[PDB]
């Protein structure tokens, strides 16, 4: 049960790290998304002007 706990906490921290990388990627996605929102807003506003 000790080595079970060890491997389990190992995989726990592992998927922690994996989902963490995925969250970092998703955050960067949101950031470039807001960049896209701003660029669409400015170009739309230019068109409307």
């Amino acid at each position: 049960v000790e080595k079970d706990l060890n491997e389990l906490q190992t995989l726990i921290e592992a998927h922690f790290e994996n989902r963490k990388k995925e969250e970092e990627e998703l955050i960067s996605l949101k950031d470039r998304i807001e960049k896209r929102r701003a660029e669409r807003a400015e170009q739309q506003r230019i068109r409307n002007e």
Binding site: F16, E23, R37
Partner: protein, 56 residues
């Protein structure tokens, strides 16, 4: 003249639709960002719990 009026009306309808769609997609993106923020907050709390459990 009839054809021109038809085309103009179509253009106005499509423009208004595009405006509504743009506003809606922006709002839904905001909602997704908020839910992601909540998920990240609870995930950081659980990560702190895991850091303490490393001492457990």
């Amino acid at each position: 003249s009839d054809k021109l009026k038809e085309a103009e009306t179509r253009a106005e309808f499509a423009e208004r639709s595009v405006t509504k769609l743009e506003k809606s997609i922006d709002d839904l993106e905001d909602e997704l960002y908020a839910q992601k923020l909540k998920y990240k907050a609870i995930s950081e709390e659980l990560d702190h719990a895991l850091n303490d459990m490393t001492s457990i």
